[PDB]
């Protein structure tokens, strides 16, 4: 009846190497970048400011506040700026998917740019919450684009970034609270899920909407593999993924560190040496910058 011959990582790998599995969508969250040292910016456990005299805590991340008082956000950005941008094994696993002609799209909730550094191109990515990779002047008639190196030196020198052409504020291309979500998120979702053969859901607790609803856009037959520290995505009994019931037929949970799960899957696929070689090479290159 079902595409997976069994509801295990081993069944997923067999399916991936069969003729039926041509197009993979990855859905990724903060869990794939924590081993790179990037904290989960939506987790209350991370330290996300009395000196700023905010009308309410969340105002640091609302667009209309930021546009009037951008200094609190950029002071926070300095505190949190990563010491290094080194993608994880999981990011390079997706680069291997791309190399092998299997990656339809990576939808990411992360703003940390590590997908791009690892070699995913614009066409491969839906950055559902934007990115720090680029920044734009906020004036609608200007919209001059600035690269991350430019924005980095403003953040560290503690100079509020202003546009060289028009002297308006320049904002990192992340989606602030109160901003529209990207049109590309909705356009790609309407097309990609007609074509997907496998969903790889990695490092997300599937608690943030509308990103979490992407799992319900897959065709009914499409297997869904969760690689995550904790099971996630099941329907909420107070009001989905079905891993464990007698009716389960396509969803598989691999519980552990995302890097270790991708390593395990690569090893089943015969890709472990390729993945190790890519990661060691790219890490060596980043370390040598």
């Amino acid at each position: 009846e079902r595409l997976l011959d069994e509801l295990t990582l081993e069944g997923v790998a067999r399916y991936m190497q069969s003729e039926r599995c041509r197009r993979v969508i990855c859905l990724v969250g903060a869990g794939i970048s924590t081993s790179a040292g990037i904290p989960d910016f939506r987790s209350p456990s991370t330290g996300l400011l009395e000196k700023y005299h905010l009308p309410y805590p969340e105002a640091i991340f609302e667009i209309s506040y930021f546009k009037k008082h951008p200094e609190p956000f950029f002071a926070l950005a300095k505190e949190l700026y990563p010491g290094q941008f080194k993608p994880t094994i999981c990011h390079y696993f997706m680069r291997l998917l791309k190399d092998k002609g299997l990656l339809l799209r990576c939808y990411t909730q992360n703003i940390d740019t590590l997908e791009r550094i690892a070699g995913l191109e614009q066409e491969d990515l839906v950055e559902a919450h934007g990115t720090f990779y680029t920044s734009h002047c906020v004036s609608a008639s200007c919209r001059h684009e600035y690269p991350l190196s430019w924005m980095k030196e403003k953040i560290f020198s503690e100079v509020t970034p202003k546009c060289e052409d028009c002297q308006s504020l320049v904002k990192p291309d992340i989606v602030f609270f109160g901003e529209s979500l990207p049109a590309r998120f909705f356009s790609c979702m309407q097309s990609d899920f007609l074509k997907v053969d496998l969903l790889l859901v990695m490092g997300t607790s599937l608690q943030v909407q509308p990103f979490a609803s992407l799992i319900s856009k897959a065709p009914l037959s499409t297997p869904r593999l969760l690689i995550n520290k904790e099971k996630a995505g099941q329907s909420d009994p107070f009001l989905g993924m079905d891993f464990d019931s007698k009716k389960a037929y396509r969803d598989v949970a691999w519980l552990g560190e995302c890097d270790q799960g991708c390593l395990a899957l690569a090893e089943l696929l015969g890709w472990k040496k390729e993945l190790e070689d890519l990661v060691r090479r790219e890490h060596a290159s980043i370390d040598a910058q």
Binding site: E58, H129, V175, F177, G178, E179, S180, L181, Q209, P210
Partner: peptide, 6 residues
């Protein structure tokens, strides 16, 4: 559609 906590 706007970005929010949920």
């Amino acid at each position: 559609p706007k970005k929010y906590g949920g």
